[PDB]
Amino acid sequence: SSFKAADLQLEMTQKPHKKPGPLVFGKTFTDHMLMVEWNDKGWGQPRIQPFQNLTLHPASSSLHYSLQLFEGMKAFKGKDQQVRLFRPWLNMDRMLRSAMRLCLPSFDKLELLECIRRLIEVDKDWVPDAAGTSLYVRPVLIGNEPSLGVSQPTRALLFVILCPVGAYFPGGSVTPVSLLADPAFIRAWVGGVGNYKLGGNYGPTVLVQQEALKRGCEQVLWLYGPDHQLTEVGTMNIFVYWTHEDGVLELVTPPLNGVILPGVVRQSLLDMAQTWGEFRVVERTITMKQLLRALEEGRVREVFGSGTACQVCPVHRILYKDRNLHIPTMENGPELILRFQKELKEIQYGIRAHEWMFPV
Amino acid sequence: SSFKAADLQLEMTQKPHKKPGPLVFGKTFTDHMLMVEWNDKGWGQPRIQPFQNLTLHPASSSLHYSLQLFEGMKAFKGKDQQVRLFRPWLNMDRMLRSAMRLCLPSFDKLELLECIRRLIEVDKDWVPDAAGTSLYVRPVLIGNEPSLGVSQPTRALLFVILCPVGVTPVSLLADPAFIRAWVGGVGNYKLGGNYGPTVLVQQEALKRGCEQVLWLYGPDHQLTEVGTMNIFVYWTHEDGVLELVTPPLNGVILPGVVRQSLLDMAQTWGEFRVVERTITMKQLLRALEEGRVREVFGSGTACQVCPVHRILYKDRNLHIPTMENGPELILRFQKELKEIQYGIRAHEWMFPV
Ligand SMILES: CCCCc1cc(=O)n2nc(NCc3ccc(Cl)cc3F)c(C#N)c2[nH]1
Ligand SMILES: CCCCc1cc(=O)n2nc(NCc3ccc(Cl)cc3F)c(C#N)c2[nH]1
Ligand SMILES: *Cc1c(COP(=O)(O)O)cnc(C)c1O
Ligand SMILES: *Cc1c(COP(=O)(O)O)cnc(C)c1O
Ligand SMILES: [Cl-]
Ligand SMILES: [Cl-]
């Protein structure tokens, strides 16, 4: 039986910290945090407490066997100062799937969402309202068994921290990135856990990113299979806007076959494009073979990443088999990207009412 | 650069805990621990201090992006109370490889080994001397960047804790649905991220009435590892040659110290062929049918060697005749390792504390 929002204990900070005035992503945090403990007596009472360190037993399974998962979603403040979360129910669904996959304790998705609402409500003055700004919300659930046996934990901690974030692009002007496409590096496997947002999926990628930077590329294009399927780009889902081999203009993204993290932005872009009804929208495997041919015949319009922190990011270059492939995204507007960006902005900041937004 | 054992800060406990008066693995800890911090100024001085909680920033990258690795090795007390570590140099080598894979700070392997030596010396009375008992040594290195960016940490924490620790065969679930590791992955490194996802799979093994997981890989159903242990098969191979085989280090196998030691020991005897080669379920099935399998077992620090008596491969329940065959090889390995570990026979593999 879940923790309940009705049982929320509150403790306000003695000295509130000074809000920012050049804000680096995920390094500046708000005054408060959510915390819930779980043990053999079930879930304790959720609490909003001042931001503070975690105290953990040195054998905590969070630190030895990676019993850890997280989420990431944004809250946006409109002109009327109303704060809204973007499609948070989907992050809750995803968090619960991750928790089950790691044998961590189940919780009630709406009870968590309400606790998170109360938390953002407490720190509402931390949500900025300038162009391209938002509050990043980082829920985390960790095992906390003081035992070196690889086992299902009998203790766990669930916490939530918040970070104001600035505009990823200057004045809403998307800047494109180069990608390294080397099949030696494999992010995730069918049957694995690449489709869950587990800490374990990220640490091994840090050296890969370093190797991309050494080869003059900004991010990693994650390839999979003997046919070099394009799966994800960095920590973002990948989209291609092109005329397909059958002559039909389409937006394509790889399907959810196990090696793809099902992004909330990804699903939202698919939803928006289907709603327009102006071109084919499909989830299909994308191979480097298909991409190279389409690039020779001039059929590729736009390539981009999607994800909460950066929203939509264009791609202009891919290094594959030591050969640079120019991707004509910025030449094609990038009008699909600019259109998505505009419609999402209107929804996120309340310019258009939308059921996707959850009011705080 | 590296922290130096010569700079060791020492804080003896004021509240020593009563030692155990049966020990469940990895749940009882000794009075002290090693702790060393790293940042933009480099490594601080190492410190032996009383066992105590860690204090971590809520955004610590150890907890969000699994910038974490660990080791496991054993110290053994002989009759004359001399304590010795088993091939600790190899764990230092492996830990450093793990650190490099996760963009965590390098350190001097001999400096850490001396710090561990000093720690175990402080807690020497915790090293039990009963037959089959030992002290388990758990070094850990974690990233500790207070930042939600997926990036190389600018801070890290290295610590070491100790557990005193106290042949019945096991059954295995062999289902190709379950994948421990993949070629191009990090299953060949001792990183925390490799273990969390196995907990649900082990629960499935228990639900199907098995005790551990036989990790299968590839279209030919290769036997890779068993639970948290490397796998060995002792058989007469299809070419009629008596052989000890274990899977090769081709990316999906954690290079065990016990595993290497068993290969070293058997190769040195020169009595039978000792190879690193993949082992497939098809080969195992045929070998069992023809009565060529002698012994199957896992190897690893915590349990040393564990015989296997049954494998459930989908719906086919396979008897493995390990115990009916002595298990002669298992017993010989256990006997010769015991002689070395407890100082009965002086050996270069042992590092005195
Ligand atoms: C899963 C991690 C959640 C928070 C987070 C951390 C982080 O470092 N990044 N980096 C991102 N974007 C970099 C990037 C830029 C262009 C392209 Cl094509 C691909 C990329 F990965 C994001 C995001 N979104 C993010 N999120
Ligand atoms: C990588 C984890 C290091 C510490 C540790 C934890 C743990 O749970 N185990 N379990 C072990 N043995 C169980 C077992 C029994 C028989 C067989 Cl065939 C396979 C098995 F995994 C070990 C060890 N060694 C261990 N170590
Ligand atoms: C978080 C994440 C995404 C994008 O998810 P959103 O829910 O859109 O923020 C894509 N790929 C990977 C690997 C991720 O971790
Ligand atoms: C630690 C470990 C082993 C065994 O290693 P030893 O060095 O012999 O203790 C085997 N397999 C896996 C997956 C491991 O983590
Ligand atoms: Cl999915
Ligand atoms: Cl290796």
Coordinates of N, CA and C in Angstrom, one line a residue, chain B residues 202-343:
Chain B
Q202 N 16.7 -13.7 -11.2 CA 17.0 -14.7 -10.1 C 15.6 -15.0 -9.4
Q203 N 14.8 -14.0 -9.2 CA 13.4 -14.3 -8.7 C 12.7 -15.3 -9.6
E204 N 12.8 -15.1 -10.9 CA 12.2 -16.0 -11.9 C 12.8 -17.4 -11.7
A205 N 14.1 -17.5 -11.5 CA 14.7 -18.8 -11.3 C 14.1 -19.5 -10.1
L206 N 13.9 -18.7 -9.0 CA 13.3 -19.3 -7.8 C 11.9 -19.7 -8.0
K207 N 11.1 -18.9 -8.7 CA 9.8 -19.3 -9.1 C 9.6 -20.6 -9.8
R208 N 10.6 -20.9 -10.7 CA 10.7 -22.1 -11.5 C 11.4 -23.3 -10.7
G209 N 11.7 -23.1 -9.4 CA 12.2 -24.1 -8.6 C 13.7 -24.3 -8.7
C210 N 14.4 -23.3 -9.3 CA 15.9 -23.4 -9.4 C 16.5 -22.4 -8.4
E211 N 17.8 -22.6 -8.2 CA 18.5 -21.8 -7.2 C 19.4 -20.6 -7.8
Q212 N 19.9 -20.8 -9.0 CA 20.7 -19.8 -9.6 C 20.3 -19.7 -11.1
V213 N 20.9 -18.7 -11.8 CA 20.6 -18.5 -13.2 C 21.8 -18.9 -14.1
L214 N 21.6 -19.8 -15.0 CA 22.6 -20.1 -16.0 C 22.5 -19.1 -17.2
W215 N 23.4 -18.2 -17.3 CA 23.3 -17.1 -18.3 C 23.7 -17.5 -19.7
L216 N 22.7 -17.6 -20.6 CA 22.9 -18.1 -22.0 C 23.1 -16.9 -22.9
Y217 N 23.9 -17.1 -23.9 CA 24.1 -16.0 -24.9 C 24.3 -16.5 -26.3
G218 N 23.7 -15.8 -27.2 CA 23.9 -16.1 -28.6 C 22.9 -17.1 -29.2
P219 N 22.9 -17.2 -30.6 CA 22.0 -18.1 -31.2 C 22.3 -19.6 -30.9
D220 N 23.5 -19.9 -30.5 CA 23.9 -21.2 -30.2 C 23.9 -21.5 -28.7
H221 N 23.2 -20.6 -27.9 CA 22.9 -20.8 -26.5 C 24.2 -21.2 -25.7
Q222 N 25.2 -20.2 -25.8 CA 26.4 -20.4 -25.1 C 26.2 -20.3 -23.6
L223 N 26.8 -21.1 -22.8 CA 26.8 -21.1 -21.3 C 27.9 -20.0 -21.0
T224 N 27.6 -18.9 -20.4 CA 28.5 -17.9 -20.1 C 29.0 -17.8 -18.7
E225 N 28.1 -17.7 -17.8 CA 28.3 -17.6 -16.3 C 27.1 -18.2 -15.6
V226 N 27.3 -18.3 -14.3 CA 26.2 -18.9 -13.5 C 26.1 -18.0 -12.2
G227 N 24.9 -17.3 -12.2 CA 24.7 -16.4 -11.1 C 25.8 -15.3 -11.2
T228 N 26.5 -15.1 -10.1 CA 27.6 -14.2 -10.1 C 29.0 -14.9 -10.1
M229 N 29.0 -16.1 -10.7 CA 30.2 -16.9 -10.8 C 30.5 -17.3 -12.2
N230 N 31.8 -17.5 -12.5 CA 32.3 -18.0 -13.8 C 31.9 -19.5 -13.8
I231 N 31.7 -20.1 -15.0 CA 31.3 -21.5 -15.2 C 32.4 -22.3 -15.8
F232 N 32.6 -23.5 -15.2 CA 33.6 -24.5 -15.7 C 32.9 -25.8 -16.0
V233 N 33.3 -26.5 -17.0 CA 32.9 -27.9 -17.3 C 34.1 -28.8 -17.5
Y234 N 34.1 -29.9 -16.8 CA 35.1 -30.9 -16.9 C 34.5 -32.1 -17.5
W235 N 35.0 -32.5 -18.7 CA 34.4 -33.6 -19.5 C 35.4 -34.2 -20.4
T236 N 35.0 -35.3 -21.1 CA 35.7 -35.7 -22.3 C 35.0 -35.0 -23.4
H237 N 35.8 -34.3 -24.2 CA 35.2 -33.5 -25.3 C 34.9 -34.4 -26.4
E238 N 34.3 -33.9 -27.5 CA 33.9 -34.7 -28.7 C 35.0 -35.3 -29.5
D239 N 36.2 -34.8 -29.3 CA 37.4 -35.4 -29.9 C 38.1 -36.5 -29.0
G240 N 37.4 -36.9 -27.9 CA 37.8 -37.9 -27.0 C 38.9 -37.5 -26.0
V241 N 39.2 -36.2 -25.9 CA 40.2 -35.7 -25.0 C 39.6 -35.2 -23.7
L242 N 40.1 -35.7 -22.6 CA 39.7 -35.2 -21.2 C 40.1 -33.8 -21.1
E243 N 39.2 -32.9 -20.7 CA 39.4 -31.5 -20.8 C 38.6 -30.7 -19.7
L244 N 39.2 -29.6 -19.2 CA 38.6 -28.6 -18.4 C 38.4 -27.4 -19.3
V245 N 37.1 -27.0 -19.5 CA 36.8 -25.8 -20.4 C 36.1 -24.7 -19.6
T246 N 36.4 -23.5 -19.9 CA 35.7 -22.3 -19.4 C 35.6 -21.3 -20.6
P247 N 34.5 -20.6 -20.6 CA 34.3 -19.6 -21.7 C 35.4 -18.6 -21.8
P248 N 35.8 -18.1 -23.0 CA 36.9 -17.2 -23.2 C 36.5 -15.7 -22.9
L249 N 37.4 -14.9 -22.6 CA 37.3 -13.5 -22.3 C 37.1 -12.7 -23.6
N250 N 35.9 -12.9 -24.2 CA 35.6 -12.2 -25.5 C 34.5 -11.1 -25.3
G251 N 34.3 -10.7 -24.1 CA 33.5 -9.5 -23.8 C 32.3 -9.7 -22.9
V252 N 31.7 -10.9 -22.9 CA 30.6 -11.2 -22.1 C 30.9 -11.9 -20.8
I253 N 32.2 -12.1 -20.5 CA 32.7 -12.8 -19.3 C 33.5 -11.9 -18.4
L254 N 33.1 -11.9 -17.1 CA 33.8 -11.2 -16.1 C 35.1 -12.0 -15.8
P255 N 36.3 -11.4 -16.0 CA 37.5 -12.2 -15.7 C 37.8 -12.4 -14.3
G256 N 37.3 -13.5 -13.7 CA 37.4 -13.9 -12.3 C 38.8 -14.2 -11.9
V257 N 39.2 -13.7 -10.7 CA 40.5 -14.2 -10.1 C 40.5 -15.7 -9.8
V258 N 39.4 -16.2 -9.3 CA 39.3 -17.6 -9.0 C 39.4 -18.4 -10.3
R259 N 38.6 -17.9 -11.3 CA 38.6 -18.5 -12.6 C 40.1 -18.6 -13.2
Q260 N 40.8 -17.5 -13.2 CA 42.2 -17.5 -13.6 C 43.1 -18.5 -12.8
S261 N 42.9 -18.5 -11.5 CA 43.6 -19.4 -10.6 C 43.4 -20.9 -10.9
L262 N 42.1 -21.2 -11.2 CA 41.8 -22.6 -11.5 C 42.4 -23.0 -12.8
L263 N 42.4 -22.1 -13.8 CA 43.1 -22.3 -15.1 C 44.6 -22.5 -14.9
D264 N 45.2 -21.6 -14.1 CA 46.6 -21.7 -13.7 C 47.0 -23.0 -13.1
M265 N 46.2 -23.4 -12.1 CA 46.4 -24.6 -11.3 C 46.4 -25.9 -12.2
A266 N 45.3 -26.0 -12.9 CA 45.1 -27.2 -13.8 C 46.1 -27.2 -14.9
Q267 N 46.5 -26.1 -15.5 CA 47.5 -26.0 -16.6 C 48.8 -26.5 -16.1
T268 N 49.2 -26.0 -14.9 CA 50.4 -26.4 -14.2 C 50.5 -27.9 -13.9
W269 N 49.4 -28.5 -13.5 CA 49.4 -30.0 -13.3 C 49.8 -30.8 -14.6
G270 N 49.3 -30.3 -15.7 CA 49.7 -30.9 -17.0 C 49.1 -32.3 -17.2
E271 N 48.0 -32.6 -16.5 CA 47.4 -33.9 -16.5 C 46.3 -34.1 -17.5
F272 N 45.7 -32.9 -18.0 CA 44.6 -32.9 -18.9 C 44.6 -31.6 -19.7
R273 N 43.8 -31.5 -20.8 CA 43.8 -30.3 -21.6 C 43.0 -29.3 -20.8
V274 N 43.4 -28.0 -20.8 CA 42.8 -26.9 -20.1 C 42.6 -25.8 -21.2
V275 N 41.4 -25.5 -21.5 CA 41.1 -24.6 -22.6 C 40.1 -23.5 -22.2
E276 N 40.2 -22.4 -22.9 CA 39.2 -21.4 -22.9 C 38.5 -21.4 -24.3
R277 N 37.3 -21.8 -24.3 CA 36.5 -22.0 -25.5 C 35.0 -21.9 -25.1
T278 N 34.2 -21.4 -26.0 CA 32.7 -21.4 -25.8 C 32.1 -22.8 -25.6
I279 N 31.1 -22.8 -24.8 CA 30.4 -24.1 -24.5 C 29.0 -23.8 -24.8
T280 N 28.4 -24.7 -25.6 CA 27.0 -24.5 -26.0 C 26.1 -25.5 -25.4
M281 N 24.8 -25.2 -25.3 CA 23.8 -26.2 -24.7 C 23.8 -27.5 -25.6
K282 N 23.9 -27.3 -26.9 CA 23.9 -28.5 -27.8 C 25.1 -29.4 -27.4
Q283 N 26.3 -28.9 -27.2 CA 27.4 -29.7 -26.8 C 27.1 -30.3 -25.4
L284 N 26.5 -29.6 -24.5 CA 26.3 -30.1 -23.1 C 25.3 -31.3 -23.2
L285 N 24.2 -31.1 -23.9 CA 23.2 -32.1 -24.1 C 23.7 -33.4 -24.6
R286 N 24.5 -33.3 -25.7 CA 25.1 -34.5 -26.3 C 26.1 -35.1 -25.4
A287 N 26.9 -34.3 -24.7 CA 27.9 -34.8 -23.8 C 27.3 -35.6 -22.6
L288 N 26.1 -35.1 -22.1 CA 25.4 -35.8 -21.0 C 24.8 -37.1 -21.5
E289 N 24.2 -37.0 -22.7 CA 23.6 -38.3 -23.3 C 24.7 -39.4 -23.5
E290 N 25.9 -39.0 -23.8 CA 27.0 -39.9 -24.1 C 27.8 -40.2 -22.8
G291 N 27.4 -39.6 -21.7 CA 28.1 -39.9 -20.4 C 29.5 -39.3 -20.3
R292 N 29.8 -38.3 -21.1 CA 31.1 -37.7 -21.1 C 31.3 -36.5 -20.1
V293 N 30.2 -36.1 -19.4 CA 30.4 -35.0 -18.5 C 30.7 -35.5 -17.1
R294 N 31.8 -35.0 -16.5 CA 32.2 -35.3 -15.2 C 31.6 -34.3 -14.1
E295 N 32.0 -33.1 -14.3 CA 31.7 -32.0 -13.3 C 31.4 -30.7 -14.0
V296 N 30.4 -30.0 -13.4 CA 30.1 -28.6 -13.8 C 30.1 -27.8 -12.5
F297 N 30.7 -26.7 -12.5 CA 30.7 -25.8 -11.3 C 31.0 -24.4 -11.6
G298 N 30.6 -23.5 -10.6 CA 30.9 -22.1 -10.7 C 32.1 -21.8 -9.9
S299 N 32.8 -20.7 -10.2 CA 33.9 -20.2 -9.5 C 33.7 -18.7 -9.1
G300 N 34.2 -18.3 -8.0 CA 34.1 -16.9 -7.5 C 34.5 -16.7 -6.1
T301 N 34.9 -15.5 -5.7 CA 35.5 -15.3 -4.4 C 34.6 -15.7 -3.2
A302 N 33.3 -15.2 -3.2 CA 32.5 -15.5 -2.0 C 32.3 -16.9 -1.6
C303 N 32.1 -17.8 -2.7 CA 31.8 -19.2 -2.5 C 32.9 -20.2 -2.9
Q304 N 33.9 -19.6 -3.6 CA 35.1 -20.4 -4.1 C 34.7 -21.2 -5.3
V305 N 34.2 -22.4 -5.0 CA 33.8 -23.3 -6.1 C 32.5 -23.9 -5.6
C306 N 31.3 -23.9 -6.5 CA 30.1 -24.6 -6.2 C 29.6 -25.5 -7.3
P307 N 29.5 -26.8 -6.9 CA 29.0 -27.8 -7.9 C 27.6 -27.6 -8.3
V308 N 27.3 -28.0 -9.5 CA 26.0 -28.0 -10.1 C 25.5 -29.4 -10.4
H309 N 24.2 -29.6 -10.0 CA 23.6 -31.0 -10.1 C 22.4 -31.0 -11.1
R310 N 21.8 -29.8 -11.4 CA 20.7 -29.9 -12.3 C 20.6 -28.6 -13.1
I311 N 20.2 -28.7 -14.4 CA 19.9 -27.6 -15.2 C 18.5 -27.7 -15.9
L312 N 17.7 -26.7 -15.6 CA 16.3 -26.7 -16.2 C 16.4 -25.9 -17.5
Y313 N 16.4 -26.5 -18.7 CA 16.6 -25.8 -20.0 C 15.3 -25.9 -20.7
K314 N 14.5 -24.8 -20.5 CA 13.2 -24.6 -20.9 C 12.3 -25.6 -20.1
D315 N 11.9 -26.7 -20.7 CA 11.1 -27.7 -20.0 C 11.9 -29.0 -19.6
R316 N 13.1 -29.1 -20.2 CA 13.9 -30.2 -20.0 C 14.8 -30.1 -18.8
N317 N 14.5 -31.0 -17.8 CA 15.2 -31.0 -16.5 C 16.4 -32.0 -16.6
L318 N 17.6 -31.4 -16.6 CA 18.8 -32.1 -16.9 C 19.6 -32.4 -15.6
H319 N 19.8 -33.7 -15.4 CA 20.7 -34.1 -14.3 C 22.2 -33.9 -14.7
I320 N 23.0 -33.3 -13.8 CA 24.4 -33.1 -14.0 C 25.1 -33.9 -13.0
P321 N 25.9 -34.9 -13.4 CA 26.4 -35.9 -12.5 C 27.7 -35.5 -11.8
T322 N 27.9 -34.3 -11.5 CA 29.0 -33.7 -10.7 C 29.3 -34.5 -9.5
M323 N 28.3 -34.7 -8.6 CA 28.6 -35.4 -7.3 C 28.9 -36.8 -7.4
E324 N 28.3 -37.5 -8.4 CA 28.6 -38.9 -8.6 C 30.0 -39.1 -9.1
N325 N 30.6 -38.0 -9.6 CA 32.0 -38.1 -10.1 C 33.0 -37.5 -9.0
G326 N 32.6 -37.6 -7.8 CA 33.5 -37.2 -6.7 C 32.9 -36.2 -5.8
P327 N 32.9 -34.9 -6.2 CA 33.4 -34.4 -7.4 C 34.9 -34.2 -7.3
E328 N 35.7 -35.1 -8.0 CA 37.1 -35.2 -7.8 C 37.9 -34.0 -8.1
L329 N 37.6 -33.3 -9.2 CA 38.3 -32.1 -9.6 C 38.0 -31.0 -8.7
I330 N 36.7 -30.8 -8.3 CA 36.3 -29.7 -7.4 C 37.1 -30.0 -6.1
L331 N 37.1 -31.2 -5.6 CA 37.7 -31.5 -4.3 C 39.2 -31.2 -4.3
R332 N 39.8 -31.5 -5.5 CA 41.3 -31.3 -5.6 C 41.6 -29.8 -5.6
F333 N 40.8 -29.0 -6.4 CA 41.0 -27.5 -6.4 C 40.8 -26.9 -5.0
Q334 N 39.8 -27.4 -4.3 CA 39.5 -26.9 -2.9 C 40.6 -27.2 -2.0
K335 N 41.1 -28.4 -2.1 CA 42.2 -28.9 -1.2 C 43.5 -28.1 -1.5
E336 N 43.9 -27.9 -2.7 CA 45.1 -27.1 -3.1 C 45.0 -25.6 -2.8
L337 N 43.8 -25.0 -3.0 CA 43.6 -23.6 -2.7 C 43.6 -23.4 -1.2
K338 N 43.1 -24.3 -0.4 CA 43.1 -24.2 1.0 C 44.5 -24.2 1.6
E339 N 45.3 -25.1 1.0 CA 46.7 -25.2 1.5 C 47.5 -23.9 1.2
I340 N 47.2 -23.2 0.1 CA 47.8 -22.0 -0.2 C 47.2 -20.8 0.6
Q341 N 45.9 -20.8 0.7 CA 45.3 -19.6 1.4 C 45.6 -19.5 2.8
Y342 N 45.6 -20.6 3.5 CA 45.8 -20.6 5.0 C 47.3 -20.8 5.4
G343 N 48.2 -20.6 4.4 CA 49.6 -20.6 4.7 C 50.3 -22.0 5.0

